[PDB]
Design a protein around this nucleic acid. Structure first.
Ligand code: MG
Length: 44
RNA sequence: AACAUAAUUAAUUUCUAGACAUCCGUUUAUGAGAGGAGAUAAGUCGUGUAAGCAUACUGGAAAGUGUGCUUGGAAU
């Protein structure tokens, strides 16, 4: 088990960074569509 | 009236709601009233100024008279 803890914790750190990047992408995509929504209402 | 949500399988919602309330007008019939043309059939008094056509007037209303036309009258 001691050896597994080191490996799992290394993968855990990688997952946190992968999750952080994916979350940022979702936040950015949300901002873009909302900005487009304003343009749609301006056109409408 | 018809947007937007979403989106590291992809889908959801939208994809409306008002207004016909009812005409103006239109056809069929009940039909007061008044005639017309028939049916049943005996009455009624009348009925020789050639006839008819069109038209006018007069006839209690078949007719008479005027005007033109016709022979589907007569005429050596
Ligand atoms: Mg006459």
């Amino acid at each position: 088990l001691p050896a597994c803890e080191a490996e799992d914790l290394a993968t855990y750190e990688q997952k946190l960074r992968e999750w952080h990047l994916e979350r940022v992408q979702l936040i950015q995509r949300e901002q873009e569509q909302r900005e487009k929504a304003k343009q749609e209402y301006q056109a409408l």
